[PDB]
Amino acid sequence: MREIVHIQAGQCGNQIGSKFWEVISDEHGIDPSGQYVGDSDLQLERINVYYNEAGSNKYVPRAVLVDLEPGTMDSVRSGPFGQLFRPDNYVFGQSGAGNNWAKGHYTEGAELVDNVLDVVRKEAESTDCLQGFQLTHSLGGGTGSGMGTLLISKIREEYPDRIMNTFSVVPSPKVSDTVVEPYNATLSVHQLVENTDSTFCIDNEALYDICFRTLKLTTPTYGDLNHLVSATMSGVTTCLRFPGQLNADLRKLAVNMVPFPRLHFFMPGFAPLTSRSNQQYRAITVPELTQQCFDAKNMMAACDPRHGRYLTAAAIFRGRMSMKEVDEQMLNIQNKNSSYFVDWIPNNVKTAVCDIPPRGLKMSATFIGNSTAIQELFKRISEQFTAMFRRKAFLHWYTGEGMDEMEFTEAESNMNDLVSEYQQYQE
Amino acid sequence: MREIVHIQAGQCGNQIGSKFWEVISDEHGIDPSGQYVGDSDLQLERINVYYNEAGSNKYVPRAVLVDLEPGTMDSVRSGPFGQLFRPDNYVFGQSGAGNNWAKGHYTEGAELVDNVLDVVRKEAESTDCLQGFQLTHSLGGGTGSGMGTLLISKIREEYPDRIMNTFSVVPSPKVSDTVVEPYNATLSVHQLVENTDSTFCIDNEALYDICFRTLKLTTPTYGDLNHLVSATMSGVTTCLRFPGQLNADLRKLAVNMVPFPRLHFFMPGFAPLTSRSNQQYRAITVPELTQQCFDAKNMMAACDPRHGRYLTAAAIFRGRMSMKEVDEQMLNIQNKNSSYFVDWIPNNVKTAVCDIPPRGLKMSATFIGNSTAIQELFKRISEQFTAMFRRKAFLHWYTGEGMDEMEFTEAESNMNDLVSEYQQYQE
Amino acid sequence: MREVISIHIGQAGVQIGNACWELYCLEHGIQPDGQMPDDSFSTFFSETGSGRHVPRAVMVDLEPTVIDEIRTGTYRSLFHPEQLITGKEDAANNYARGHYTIGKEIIDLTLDRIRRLADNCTGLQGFLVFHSFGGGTGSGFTSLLMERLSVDYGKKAKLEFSIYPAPQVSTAVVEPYNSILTTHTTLEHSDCSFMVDNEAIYDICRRNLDIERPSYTNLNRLIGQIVSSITASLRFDGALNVDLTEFQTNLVPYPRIHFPLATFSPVISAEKAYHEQLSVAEITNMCFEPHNQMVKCDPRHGKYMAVCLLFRGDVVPKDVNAAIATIKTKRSIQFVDWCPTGFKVGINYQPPTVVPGGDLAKVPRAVCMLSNTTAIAEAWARLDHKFDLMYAKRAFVHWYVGEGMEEGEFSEAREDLAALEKDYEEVGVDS
Amino acid sequence: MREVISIHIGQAGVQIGNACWELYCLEHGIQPDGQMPSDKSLGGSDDSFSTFFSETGSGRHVPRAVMVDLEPTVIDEIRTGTYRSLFHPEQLITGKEDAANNYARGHYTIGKEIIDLTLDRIRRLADNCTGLQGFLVFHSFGGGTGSGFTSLLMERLSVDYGKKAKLEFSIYPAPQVSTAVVEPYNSILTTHTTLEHSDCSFMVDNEAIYDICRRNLDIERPSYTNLNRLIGQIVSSITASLRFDGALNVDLTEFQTNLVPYPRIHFPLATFSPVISAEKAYHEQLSVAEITNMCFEPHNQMVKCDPRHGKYMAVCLLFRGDVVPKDVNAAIATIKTKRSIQFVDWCPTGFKVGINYQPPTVVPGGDLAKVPRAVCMLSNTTAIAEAWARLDHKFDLMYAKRAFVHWYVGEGMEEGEFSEAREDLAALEKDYEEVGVDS
Amino acid sequence: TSPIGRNRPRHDSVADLMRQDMLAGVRAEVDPNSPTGLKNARDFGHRRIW
Amino acid sequence: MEIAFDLSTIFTDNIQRLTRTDLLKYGPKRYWAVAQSIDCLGEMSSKFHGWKRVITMYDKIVDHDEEQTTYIMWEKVNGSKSILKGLLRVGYKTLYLTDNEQNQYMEKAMCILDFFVVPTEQRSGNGFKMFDEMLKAENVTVDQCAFDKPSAALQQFLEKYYDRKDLVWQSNKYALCSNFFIGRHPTVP
Numbered sequence A, B: 001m002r003e004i005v006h007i008q009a010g011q012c013g014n015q016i017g018s019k020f021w022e023v024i025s026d027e028h029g030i031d032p033s034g035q036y037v038g039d040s041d042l043q044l045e046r047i048n049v050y051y052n053e054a055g056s057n058k059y060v061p062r063a064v065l066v067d068l069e070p071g072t073m074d075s076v077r078s079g080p081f082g083q084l085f086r087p088d089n090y091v092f093g094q095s096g097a098g099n100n101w102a103k104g105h106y107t108e109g110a111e112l113v114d115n116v117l118d119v120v121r122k123e124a125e126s127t128d129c130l131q132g133f134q135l136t137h138s139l140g141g142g143t144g145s146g147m148g149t150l151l152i153s154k155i156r157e158e159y160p161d162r163i164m165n166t167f168s169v170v171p172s173p174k175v176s177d178t179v180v181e182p183y184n185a186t187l188s189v190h191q192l193v194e195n196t197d198s199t200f201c202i203d204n205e206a207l208y209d210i211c212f213r214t215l216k217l218t219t220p221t222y223g224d225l226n227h228l229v230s231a232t233m234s235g236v237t238t239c240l241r242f243p244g245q246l247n248a249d250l251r252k253l254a255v256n257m258v259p260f261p262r263l264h265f266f267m268p269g270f271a272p273l274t275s276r277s278n279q280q281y282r283a284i285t286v287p288e289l290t291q292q293c294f295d296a297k298n299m300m301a302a303c304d305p306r307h308g309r310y311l312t313a314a315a316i317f318r319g320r321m322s323m324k325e326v327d328e329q330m331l332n333i334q335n336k337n338s339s340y341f342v343d344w345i346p347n348n349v350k351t352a353v354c355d356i357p358p359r360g361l362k363m364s365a366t367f368i369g370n371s372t373a374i375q376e377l378f379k380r381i382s383e384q385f386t387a388m389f390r391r392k393a394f395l396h397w398y399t400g401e402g403m404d405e406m407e408f409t410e411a412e413s414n415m416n417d418l419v420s421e422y423q424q425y426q427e
Numbered sequence C: 001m002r003e004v005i006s007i008h009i010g011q012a013g014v015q016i017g018n019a020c021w022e023l024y025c026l027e028h029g030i031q032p033d034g035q036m037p038d039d040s041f042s043t044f045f046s047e048t049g050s051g052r053h054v055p056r057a058v059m060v061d062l063e064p065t066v067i068d069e070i071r072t073g074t075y076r077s078l079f080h081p082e083q084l085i086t087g088k089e090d091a092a093n094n095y096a097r098g099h100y101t102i103g104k105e106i107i108d109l110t111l112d113r114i115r116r117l118a119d120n121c122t123g124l125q126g127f128l129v130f131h132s133f134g135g136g137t138g139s140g141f142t143s144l145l146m147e148r149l150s151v152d153y154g155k156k157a158k159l160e161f162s163i164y165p166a167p168q169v170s171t172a173v174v175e176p177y178n179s180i181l182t183t184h185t186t187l188e189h190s191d192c193s194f195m196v197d198n199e200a201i202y203d204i205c206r207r208n209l210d211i212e213r214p215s216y217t218n219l220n221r222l223i224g225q226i227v228s229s230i231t232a233s234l235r236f237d238g239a240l241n242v243d244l245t246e247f248q249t250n251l252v253p254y255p256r257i258h259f260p261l262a263t264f265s266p267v268i269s270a271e272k273a274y275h276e277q278l279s280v281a282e283i284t285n286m287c288f289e290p291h292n293q294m295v296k297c298d299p300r301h302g303k304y305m306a307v308c309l310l311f312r313g314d315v316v317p318k319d320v321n322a323a324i325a326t327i328k329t330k331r332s333i334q335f336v337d338w339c340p341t342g343f344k345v346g347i348n349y350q351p352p353t354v355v356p357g358g359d360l361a362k363v364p365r366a367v368c369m370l371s372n373t374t375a376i377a378e379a380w381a382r383l384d385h386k387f388d389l390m391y392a393k394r395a396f397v398h399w400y401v402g403e404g405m406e407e408g409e410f411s412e413a414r415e416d417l418a419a420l421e422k423d424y425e426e427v428g429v430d431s
Numbered sequence D: 001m002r003e004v005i006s007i008h009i010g011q012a013g014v015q016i017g018n019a020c021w022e023l024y025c026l027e028h029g030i031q032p033d034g035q036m037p038s039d040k041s042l043g044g045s046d047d048s049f050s051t052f053f054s055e056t057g058s059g060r061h062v063p064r065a066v067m068v069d070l071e072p073t074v075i076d077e078i079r080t081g082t083y084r085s086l087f088h089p090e091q092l093i094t095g096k097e098d099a100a101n102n103y104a105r106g107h108y109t110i111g112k113e114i115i116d117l118t119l120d121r122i123r124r125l126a127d128n129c130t131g132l133q134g135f136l137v138f139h140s141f142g143g144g145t146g147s148g149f150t151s152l153l154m155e156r157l158s159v160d161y162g163k164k165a166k167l168e169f170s171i172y173p174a175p176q177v178s179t180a181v182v183e184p185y186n187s188i189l190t191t192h193t194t195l196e197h198s199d200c201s202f203m204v205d206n207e208a209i210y211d212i213c214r215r216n217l218d219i220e221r222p223s224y225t226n227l228n229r230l231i232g233q234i235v236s237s238i239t240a241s242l243r244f245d246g247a248l249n250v251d252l253t254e255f256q257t258n259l260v261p262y263p264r265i266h267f268p269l270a271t272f273s274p275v276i277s278a279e280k281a282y283h284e285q286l287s288v289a290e291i292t293n294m295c296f297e298p299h300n301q302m303v304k305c306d307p308r309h310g311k312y313m314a315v316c317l318l319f320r321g322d323v324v325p326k327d328v329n330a331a332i333a334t335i336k337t338k339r340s341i342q343f344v345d346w347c348p349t350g351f352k353v354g355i356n357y358q359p360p361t362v363v364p365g366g367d368l369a370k371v372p373r374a375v376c377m378l379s380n381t382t383a384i385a386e387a388w389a390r391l392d393h394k395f396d397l398m399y400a401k402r403a404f405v406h407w408y409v410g411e412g413m414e415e416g417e418f419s420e421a422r423e424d425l426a427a428l429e430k431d432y433e434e435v436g437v438d439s
Numbered sequence E: 001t002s003p004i005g006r007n008r009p010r011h012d013s014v015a016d017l018m019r020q021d022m023l024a025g026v027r028a029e030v031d032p033n034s035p036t037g038l039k040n041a042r043d044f045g046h047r048r049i050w
Numbered sequence F: 001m002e003i004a005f006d007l008s009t010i011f012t013d014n015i016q017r018l019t020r021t022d023l024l025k026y027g028p029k030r031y032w033a034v035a036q037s038i039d040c041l042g043e044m045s046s047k048f049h050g051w052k053r054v055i056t057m058y059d060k061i062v063d064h065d066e067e068q069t070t071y072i073m074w075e076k077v078n079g080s081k082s083i084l085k086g087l088l089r090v091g092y093k094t095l096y097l098t099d100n101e102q103n104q105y106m107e108k109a110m111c112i113l114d115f116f117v118v119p120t121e122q123r124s125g126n127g128f129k130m131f132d133e134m135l136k137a138e139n140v141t142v143d144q145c146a147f148d149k150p151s152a153a154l155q156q157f158l159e160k161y162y163d164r165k166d167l168v169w170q171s172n173k174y175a176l177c178s179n180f181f182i183g184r185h186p187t188v189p
């Protein structure tokens, strides 16, 4: 009754989406072949949110797997849980955008977006009542960033009323892996501001820092970071699929956390993250859970919230718990840190509780925050873009597909306006 | 009760008949040796429709294999089901007709027609109450196109009231493998229009297109095409062998479809045809089955059904399904495509639901369509015949066997009347 | 069940028969002594009851040196010793000597042997006459033999494989006369005359096979491959079998238009076949190249009328249909407007067998494109020009008229061939 | 699904292609005679062989190579060598007379003889592959054939195809070890064409690789075989991302976008840092940090130039084997914090990282030891402008006296081409000077 | 040498495509040391932590 | 798996040797059962291993440039009906072997082209019987045989049933055992 359409774009988007679907199938007890092997009636109930029916208790996701490189489709199919997806939902081009925003946004992305929209519309029309769309991509690349932004614009044009959540992986200079990432990020920020209901900024630096200092993982790979992002993504929409004492869908979170239309860039997080060595030395009750939630070192946006007060906060709890403890913990964390919250808003934290925790955990909480620390996240990109555009480096690659310097200036101005909007409420 | 005599003429007819008997043996659990190894009582209560009991749990098919060259019949004897047929039912000549209608109809065919009629009469007199005749042939060849028509004339003279069913493979220009096939096609349809009661038009082009688009088979061999035709043949007469909620035998179909004596050319099809990749991810339901039955790409004739108004249609569903769903789906198909059906017939389609699906299949539906679009095949054959007859391209071969140039003129004119009548009711 | 009588006349016909029977023995696994270490060989061999296999062939030739080579050769044990008909004096490249004078000496024995072969049969399909137009006996004796066969077996088919004079390469001074005289008897009695040219096969061997100096031992092997591809439908099963009767029905539009060409597609060297993807489309496309026909003529200057493609080996019918559609899309390959479906297809499952030491390479598939086109009239025009030049001054007609033969039949045959080429020109006209 | 075309021109190009195709045959498990013994590899993810080797129905694999040379000696040596049955006989294009170390002979007089056949064979190869990704061109930068015929073929290919990528692996003349007296003339005449029509030209010096072999391999007196093996290793590591699975796959278009900032500034360097003998490898730890550090030292560059005088502009590190991105990030941080390694101010991030999960293969009998990790550091450094300056100085020294101009003008090539090429190279050096200076 | 009969043209792939219950499901596991196996283990897998 | 034919009327024993000459004799025109068994077992092996195309086919064997031997294990069920319990294809090939210390070899050794046992009979301990029968019939020791891209399960099979471990891998996707005493080195370092 509240179906969600999932779109994966680019290599990072496809890998995070594969991890996300693996985690959801774990939660719903769905076999990797599409069969249902769950043991609880709750998992099968309201399974239509993320899955369709294929007869003989076989369920397939509503995912649309999108990339300009067929190698990503081959890897997804060969990887675990790759048999779960519908083959007709695999849409691909001849070759990747090559880290070029224009290549993936004006010619190859334009040619493939028709097929992608056809698949998305076919999936959406089958739903009884879709709540909205969620999309996973990376801002640093060409294919993901550019053509995912094109998809965002097209879908927002087609479905103006539905909730649009993008879990974009923003680039950071510490863990830079490409050269022309600032150009694509700056060109995508404008589209993300314009045509998204709520976007969850994710950074690789923050995920590596979490895996290194919160966990004690030796040689973390992309799989662990994708699993953390997957856990956050699953915990965001846990109320839609399971009963709870105080439910909250995506629209409720958007209402709570968006004081103003452009101020919807969130900061995700996960509560029960702790090392394997410290499993037995630390309890997992509500107080320490919220303490982690609001800890500055447990954020996936690679920004210190201590440099900017939160506009709003939201901790979506899971598992059996008492609302009194949750409410008093939220009040304590909002009063003891009054310098880290805005005064002009009386209550900053929205609390949601679900009765089903993730498998293997007694209770879990997902923290998302509309802090003003995103100022630094976009300031890094603005600085890099300004430095590169001062001497017009690598610009001929973008101008060779139809772009112009005027569009680059427009994107830079829009992102500067957004960061100024965050700044002027910091005070 | 309601026994059916099956006759295989020519190489293509023999191949199709062998595949059809393999399919039927699979349906009824008949071992290739002729024994019964089935597991359901309903597979044996109506074994007399297609088979004769040999006493020692052996069920020889009621089939007559006729071909002017012994190579095909030797291959059938050495094939997988060489022990099934009665050894004396094999009737053959010394040399083939050589793709010559005159050779296979006037002298070489007529030498063997006496023996063929003798064995057909012997098989027919062994039935409790004969229903009709099934004959499989190809219009493009010489042996098939001539001997089959002569046999049809002889049987119609002998049995004027029994139903006559011919599964003819009409030649197609895109898969043309004979230089003089339009001549044989015209000289065959001349007798087919007057004599038979239901001709199922099959095109190799349409079958290849099905195996490519739908089943996504890279290398479609003749086994696949013969198996498709066999599935259609099994679906047509499934109400004579298994119980069903709604029953429709050959005579019921003949009454329901043809409004006029000469409009008995049908376009068949099959609903559950799906590729291996999409096999698991597609839920087979009555709406999907009906949509695939009425899909233009699923037709087994090259002519597009969208180019002419449907006169009558018949979908013989197989499997346990609710009659309300079937009726609502068929009415929805009629209403959506109201421009594709004749307005002077209120209900344009006949429905039949059987209880026993094909083995290994949960739900199936066989489509039989009678549309004016079938005039396209005859128009193409007429164009080719006119082009070759303007200069008597190969007429000397036919005139050497006793034919006349006036007979060729009559056949072209008579087939033009068939095109005219089909075009008459299409506006 | 279905067996074919093969007759070889003249040195060219006899040597071509040697190559053909070597190829057949290799294909069916028959040793040169005749012993075989199922029903495949029934077409081209007769069971002796004792396990030996005698080929159904007659080697007739006026000069005995080549037949003596056979009788002293490796294959001296295959053929029936009384089937190797011999004479004493050759025709000396004279039509009259082979037609009347020396012909009547052994024509009765040849007819008796042919009747003996036909009587020991149940399913006779046709005749395979191998001869050369330019030769003396291979023209006159062939004419007389076919004249008697058209009387004794008027119903059976007569497939003739004739060596044709080359446009430039010549080995005789009076071969135009013999060819012109034989063109009379080809029309009257024969049913399909797959003429081939020595110069065309020379060019094929020089270009595709890359051998620089072939001496008849590659030409005969190629002709044997062609005839084996033609007759493979009668002894090996497969999809879309093509018997001789349907072959003639599809290939011969009019009684006088019965002179098809011949072509073998995958004729490539051993070291080049290893690095080439010999797809069905590729071989079908390279069939129609002008530099691949075995007759020295340009098919692009004429209109195709009926094309037979006898595919062999591992071939899928859908590939054949796609290749034929590709061929029909091209405008260079022009077909007559009155034959919209001028393609006849045969797909035999048996791949070709390559002879040890042969020039041909081992390939999984092959096709023999047999096209009846109006472009063959150029060769007849060339022989008409040569005959007119040689007959204006009456260069050597005295040798003919001095051997019990009339002068007027020269002009009669000349106007017969003129009528034939006029008929081809008339038929080639689009409706 | 992704295929590239390898074109080898001249003696140096063909000889380097020998090692390149040996490396490819060992890497993809293809025997030198053409057969691929592994039937199971004809399926699944093991279909990587289609990138270089075209498949035939007979089970043989035909490399997508065009070995063209104006003289038949080297190609005949191949045809009598072990790889005689590997290449297609029609692809091995031969002339009758070499270019005699003359640009004009290779460009016009002898070029026009077989340029049409070479283009026909290249077109035939291109029409066979459905996923043509680009062209790999191997040629001696200062030879006769490898200059003139390479120029002609490159301009013809640019006309015919256009948007398809074209990557050149040239043998730049060494500052001191030059085997011919007329090297700079051909070098600067082909500089004009290689700049206009190519996309990424990775020049190589023989002396630099000689020094690398002497130091890192203890090979006192090396030969051309070692140099060819090293160049083949570099090319295999470059193309590894097109045929193997790994995090951060780098396509050719990704490489061009990341590394080439301006249309004319497209002449990078190349180095295969983890080059070490079988003995020193035991003592070395061979981790990501040290192999990344070894890339940037001046003694490991395969062009005889000191990077310290030239600020780095864009670096593409193509890792292989057991590599985890955290190690690459740490190495990048340590490289950026170094004061000696000077980057430009207009490129805040100049590292493009490509990781592959296929460890490098080692040819038996080769000097390179088996390693678990490998990396190619392709840097668009400005310091090679010193090498161009040396080449221009040599050209000026010979052209001040018209040393051998008559040889060139006697084959239909104008004398003004020398001045045109000199001013083009001067413009290229001026562009490098303009780009290198900080804002 | 003997005549060769072929079984590929006699294959009937459609007879299996018409099934709707027979599902393979189980698939082989790629080599962990292979690049595909390494990618599946690193970018498509995770060390369990809760 | 199951085949609607009585395989006991052709095959003289449970595990029947099938050479190229044997397969040519058992033509699909009159002996379709053996060809269908080969093709279906090859299709099952390809489906289980996930290969893009089927590597084991009757036509691919009969027309192969080199002689190959395939092994079939069956079981008569009732009348004209039988089941198939495995497939094994072996043959001789020329391999460019490379042992330790970068020694180059060029020796002729047995190859394991295809080895597959049906899942229902995989736990019955019958693949060992099939391999023992192959070794007895072709009198080749495990020392001088080569494995074409052996799977993991094959690795445990070898190291458990023959105590053969540490399969040294060659460049041609072949993992031959640690027994390189076949012949002298064509080249030494």
Ligand SMILES: Nc1nc2c(ncn2[C@@H]2O[C@H](COP(=O)(O)CP(=O)(O)OP(=O)(O)O)[C@@H](O)[C@H]2O)c(=O)[nH]1
Pocket (backbone or CB within 6 Å): B009, B010, B011, B012, B013, B015, B016, B068, B069, B096, B097, B098, B099, B100, B104, B138, B140, B141, B142, B143, B144, B145, B169, B171, B175, B176, B177, B178, B204, B222, B223, B225, B226, C240, C246
């Ligand atoms: N759908 C099928 N079409 C077939 C099959 N076999 C042949 N054909 C087609 O049939 C057409 C010719 O039919 P036949 O080959 O059966 C000729 P016929 O037996 O009627 O006469 P003769 O020439 O006297 O043998 C031609 O288009 C073939 O491609 C088959 O198994 N299935």
Ligand SMILES: Nc1nc2c(ncn2[C@@H]2O[C@H](COP(=O)(O)OP(=O)(O)OP(=O)(O)O)[C@@H](O)[C@H]2O)c(=O)[nH]1
Pocket (backbone or CB within 6 Å): D009, D010, D011, D012, D013, D015, D016, D069, D070, D071, D098, D099, D100, D101, D102, D106, D140, D141, D142, D143, D144, D145, D146, D147, D171, D173, D178, D179, D180, D206, D224, D227, D228
């Ligand atoms: N690394 C390497 N350098 C080579 C090789 N062959 C030649 N060179 C260098 O390339 C330059 C000349 O190359 P040539 O091979 O002489 O050039 P070409 O243009 O092919 O010569 P012609 O065919 O005589 O016109 C010199 O600097 C040589 O040292 C080789 O195999 N490997």
Ligand SMILES: O=S(=O)(O)CCN1CCN(CCS(=O)(=O)O)CC1
Pocket (backbone or CB within 6 Å): F115, F116, F117, F121, F122, F123, F124, F125, F126, F127, F128, F150, F151, F152, F153, F154, F157
């Ligand atoms: O032998 S037993 O039946 O006990 C075990 C089954 N056996 C294992 C070894 N191989 C599998 C190799 S592969 O098919 O995985 O490559 C044949 C099957």
